[PDB]
Amino acid sequence: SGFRKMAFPSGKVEGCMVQVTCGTTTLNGLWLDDVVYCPRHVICTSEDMLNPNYEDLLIRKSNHNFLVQAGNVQLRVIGHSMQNCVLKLKVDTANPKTPKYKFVRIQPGQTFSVLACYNGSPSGVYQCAMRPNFTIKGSFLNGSCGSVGFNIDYDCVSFCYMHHMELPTGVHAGTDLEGNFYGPFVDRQTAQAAGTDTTITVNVLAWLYAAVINGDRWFLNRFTTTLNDFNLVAMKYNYEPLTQDHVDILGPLSAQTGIAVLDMCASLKELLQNGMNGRTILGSALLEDEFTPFDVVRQCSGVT
Amino acid sequence: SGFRKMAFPSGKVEGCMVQVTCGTTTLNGLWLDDVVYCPRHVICTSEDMLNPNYEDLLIRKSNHNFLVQAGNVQLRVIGHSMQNCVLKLKVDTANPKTPKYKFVRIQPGQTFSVLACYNGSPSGVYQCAMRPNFTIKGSFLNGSCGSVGFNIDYDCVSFCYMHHMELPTGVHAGTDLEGNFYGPFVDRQTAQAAGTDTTITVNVLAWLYAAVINGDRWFLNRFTTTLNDFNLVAMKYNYEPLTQDHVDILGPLSAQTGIAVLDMCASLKELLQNGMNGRTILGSALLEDEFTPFDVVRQCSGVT
Ligand SMILES: Cc1ccncc1NC(=O)CNC(=O)Cc1cccnc1
Ligand SMILES: Cc1ccncc1NC(=O)CNC(=O)Cc1cccnc1
């Protein structure tokens, strides 16, 4: 028993982190096979970031201008290309620690682990969710760009995020491993304000199920609701609409606990309207939304 | 910017996890050099756990009764001994992935990362704190015993915890790597109730400093207090007393933010007396106490 915000074991990703330097800018790179992936803004100075023309800035760079270091050994760069907002640096050595991997583009509400790195060295691992406004609330300082987000399915690492930007509001923006930003963000130091950070309803419900499985049941009430009635309350509280697809995804948690999804929705509706009244659920005084239904099933069943 | 509950990168510890089976009981072991450390209750059946005589139960076990598997390869056990509540199984092969390591016994209030494992396989990593009542609030299911807690200082892993028990209240108990339980707990399936789970005051203050560094400043007030006045309020709210040693440890955070430790104590005192009023600090509606002052400095400076 017990339920924790849990990241994937990071070892497989640690074996992929490298340091990438271009001129005076140093950030992180991801070494998979004989390619090093990194944010294309490695070629910019902080001044260039105000209004960069990446294609133009890249013409002034050759293979030998990208310095790649894995541990304390230098990798030889034999090619470089820009794919969307990432640079792919072909090196002459395949990463011997390359795990089985995939590049996936996740949907808002999906969670993942981030291995925060500085100078190609891992500092820590934490669990994030892609917010409904396509930002992530991470912990990233100067030099953390190129740190990646991932999920692991047994031995296959699905890379879903690469860190690029910190918006003026202190929230984070980045790309998938094909270099496409999540949301409308751009790799330019300019006014980029985020949209509404709504709560991931399906994740809150999955976490309420985890709370019941772990003995925290005070919030269970004698009511039920419908998707339409629930969604009227959800809109009012800046919660994402719940669809029949979300109800389907919560099916196994409903079956395991004997609590119908719409009954849990009614419990959630009362929590929104009445508040927590100084009480806690799984040690939290707010409704947690960074556990997907799959994460709850995995953690509650011990998936390795 | 941003502040997250962050665990250490777990790779170094993943390379140490093995599966240990004795009869019908399977749990995790920690392989360092040519020794595998595991909870001595691996020799018990669930029935033995009610009132086990470990020395007696151990007489019926030989080296060949301990099955140790690292990945999918079996290790040969050439010796076994009991040290307090852990078994040390000498194997004929030194773990080739043994990191630089130390065995440390931590004090209450200290944080660490847990690599939750099942059948010697890592499932996830999360950050814990040794509670003032010597329990930890982890996420551990059947088969997770032998999972370890650790801190990393650059390349040296300091192992501080090994999982042994889940108390009837769903909180966790375990030992250091010398097999001595933290607190008054025993490896027996019997009534063991935990003491008061007080809040780690020095950790809450360090986290309030992290909140200021990251822009969350609404809670800063126009007051100051003294250690004695603060401690009268702390006692009332089940917060640990704050000592001059804690004030000293918070010195660098006070210097970085220009906020005197006693002023932050006064802010905390008002948060206790007035409540959060529906507001959040670093995305939390309660005062977080599982970040030490050292963790705040590390995360806010990017220590790798
Ligand atoms: C400041 C920050 C913090 C965390 N994560 C990300 C960031 N960075 C940004 O949003 C914007 N980039 C910079 O200001 C620094 C820079 C210079 C030259 C080339 N690339 C980047
Ligand atoms: C039940 C549990 C869950 C999480 N962490 C720990 C535990 N385990 C316990 O507190 C007590 N041990 C058992 O009930 C299981 C067992 C059988 C035979 C030999 N050792 C252990």
Q: Is B272:B289 a contact under the CB 8 Å cutoff?
A: no
Q: Angle of helix A201-213 relative to helix A293-301, nearest 10 degrees?
A: 20
Contact call for B121 and A8, based on CB within 8 A: no
Question: Cα–Cα distance between A290 and A160 in angstroms, integer?
Answer: 16
Residues in chain A: 304
Q: Residues in chain B, how many?
A: 304
Measured CA to CA, the distance from residue B112 to residue B148 in angstroms comes to 10
What's A212's DSSP letter? H
Q: What is the atom index within ligand 1 of the atom nearest the CA of A166?
A: 10
DSSP output for chain B: ------BPP-HHHHTTEEEEEETTEEEEEEEETTEEEEEGGGG--TTGGGS--HHHHHHT--GGGEEEEETTEEEPEEEEEEETTEEEEEESS--TTPPEEEE--PPTT-EEEEEEEETTEEEEEEEEE--TTS-B-----TT-TT-EEEEEETTEEEEEEEEEEE-TTS-EEEE-TTSPBSTT--SSSS--------B-HHHHHHHHHHHHHTT--TT--S----HHHHHHHHHHTTBPPP-HHHHHHHHHHHHHHT--HHHHHHHHHHHHHH--TT--BTTBSS------HHHHHHHHHT--
The answer to whether residue B145 is catalytic is yes
Closest by Cα among B98, B295, B214, B252 to A123:
B295
Give A56's contacts (C-beta < 8 A, 6+ positions apart).
Answer: none
A16, A22, A38, A41: which one is catalytic? A41
DSSP-derived secondary structure for B105-172: -PPTT-EEEEEEEETTEEEEEEEEE--TTS-B-----TT-TT-EEEEEETTEEEEEEEEEEE-TTS-E
Burial class (CB in 10 A: 0-12, 13-18, 19+), A196: exposed
Could you tell me the two tokens for B172?
């966790």
Q: Are A178 and A83 in contact (CB under 8 A)?
A: yes
What's the Cα-to-Cα distance from A257 to each of A210, A291, B139, rounded to whole Å? 9, 17, 19
Residue-by-residue DSSP string for A109-154:
T-EEEEEEEETTEEEEEEEEE--TTS-B-----TT-TT-EEEEEET
Question: What's the rounded Cα separation, in Å, for the pair B57 and B104?
Answer: 28
Residue type, A180: N
The token pair at A221 is 């009430």
Distance from C-alpha of B132 to C-alpha of B107, rounded to nearest angstrom: 9
Elucidation technique:
X-ray
Class of residue A253 by CB neighbours under 10 A (exposed 0-12, middle 13-18, buried 19+): buried
Residues 6+ apart with CB under 8 A from B153: none
Residues 6+ apart with CB under 8 A from A151: A8, A104, A111, A112, A113, A157, A158, A160
Supply the residue whose CA is at minimum distance from atom 1 of ligand 1. A142
User: For residue A101, which of A30, A44, A172 has the smallest C-alpha distance?
Assistant: A30
Give me the phi and psi of B281, to 5 degrees please: -125, 115
Instruction: Indicate the SS3 state at residue A295.
Output: helix
Both tokens of A59, joined, read 């013409």
Dihedral of alpha carbons B189, B190, B191, B193, sign? negative
What CA–CA distance (Å, rounded) separates B117 from B140?
9
Name the H helices within A140-260: 201-213, 227-236, 244-257
User: Within its chain, how far is the Cα of B67 from the centroid?
Assistant: 27
Atom of ligand 1 nearest to the CA of A189: 11
The residue whose CA is least distant from atom 13 of ligand 1 is A46
Q: Cα(B304)–Cα(B298) distance, rounded to whole angstroms? A: 8
Instruction: Tell me the C-alpha distance between A34 and A79, whole Å.
Output: 10
User: DSSP label at A98?
Assistant: P
The Cα–Cα gap between A275 and A260 comes to 22
Asked whether the beta carbons of A99 and B14 are under 8 A apart, the reply is: no
Q: Going by C-beta distance under 8 Å and a sequence separation of 6 or more, which residues neighbour residue B45?
A: B23, B24, B25
The angle, 0 to 180 degrees and rounded to 10, between the axes of the packed helices B293-301 and B244-257 is 20
- Are A193 and A48 a contacting pair, CB within 8 Å? no
CATH code linked to domain A1-14+100-197: 2.40.10.10
* Euclidean distance between CA atoms A300 and A287, whole angstroms: 18
**Is CATH 1.10.1840.10 the classification given to domain B198-301?**
yes
Chain B residues closer than 8 Å to A128 by CB: 4
For residue B151, give the chain A residue with the closest CA: A124
With contacts defined as CB-CB under 8 Å, which chain B residues touch A142? 302
Ligand 1 in reach of A173 Cβ (< 6 A): no
Q: Give the CATH number of domain A15-99.
A: 2.40.10.10
Query: Both tokens of residue B62?
Result: 């030989």
Interface touch A302/B278, C-beta < 8 Å: no
Nearest partner of B167 among B140, B191, B198, judged by Cα: B191
**A58 touches A43 (CB < 8 A):** yes
* Alpha carbons B265 and B231: distance in angstroms, whole number: 9
Domains of chain B, by residue range, sit at 1-14+100-197, 15-99, 198-301
Rounded Cα distance between A148 and A138, Å, is 11
A78 within 8 A of A63, measured Cβ to Cβ? yes
Amino acid at B51: N
Which of B3, B13, B123, B136 is the mutation pick for testing A, counting most A CBs within 10 A?
A: B123
Backbone angles phi, psi at A248, to 5 degrees: -60, -45
Tokens standing for A189?
């130091």
Six token digits for residue B211: 């909140």
Resolution in A: 1.5
Closest by CA position to B27, among listed B162, B199, B208 = B162
How far apart are alpha carbons A126 and A295 in whole angstroms? Answer: 14
> Chain centroid to CA A237: how far?
24
Query: Interhelix angle for A244-257 vs A201-213, to 10°?
Result: 0
E strand or H helix at A91: strand A86-91
Helix (H) or strand (E) holding A35: strand A35-39
CA distance B293 to A121: 22
Token pair 């200021």 in the structure block, residue = B212
Residue B246's identity, in one-letter code, is: H
B172 catalytic per annotation: no
Angle at A298 between CA A294 and CA A303, to 5 degrees: 140
Look up residue A49 and give its DSSP letter.
G
Degrees, nearest 5: CA angle A151-B149-B67: 85
Residue A20 CB neighbours (<10 A)? 28
φ/ψ of residue B226, rounded to 5: -120, 165
Chain A residues close to B3, C-beta within 8 Å: 139
Cα–Cα dist A121/A31, whole Å: 13
Cα distances from A145 to residues A54, A173, A262, in angstroms, run: 17, 10, 42
Cα–Cα distances in angstroms (integers) from residue B52 to residues A5, A173, B186, B189, in the given order: 34, 55, 11, 9
Buried b (16+ CB within 10 A) or exposed e, B238-274: ebbebeeebbebbeebbeebebebbbbbbbbbbbbee
Q: How far apart are alpha carbons A218 and A232 in whole angstroms?
A: 24
Instruction: Check A118 against B302: CB less than 8 A apart.
Output: yes
- In the set B128, B145, B160, B265, the catalytic residue is B145
CB B257 within 8 A of CB B212: yes
Query: CA B174, CA B187: separation in Å to the nearest integer?
Result: 9
B1-14+100-197 shares its CATH topology with B15-99: yes
Alpha carbon distance A151, A147 (integer Å) = 14
Contact between B211 and B217 under an 8 Å Cβ cutoff? The reply is yes
Closest to A68 in 3D by CA, of A119, A6, A144, A116: A119
Residues 6+ apart with CB under 8 A from A62: none
Ligand nearest to C-alpha A21: 1
User: Which residues on adjacent β-strands are paired with residue A174?
Assistant: A163
CB under 8 A, 24+ apart: contacts of B46-50:
B46/B189, B49/B187, B49/B188, B49/B189, B50/B188, B50/B189, B50/B190
Residues paired with residue B37 on neighbouring β-strands, in sequence order = B30, B88
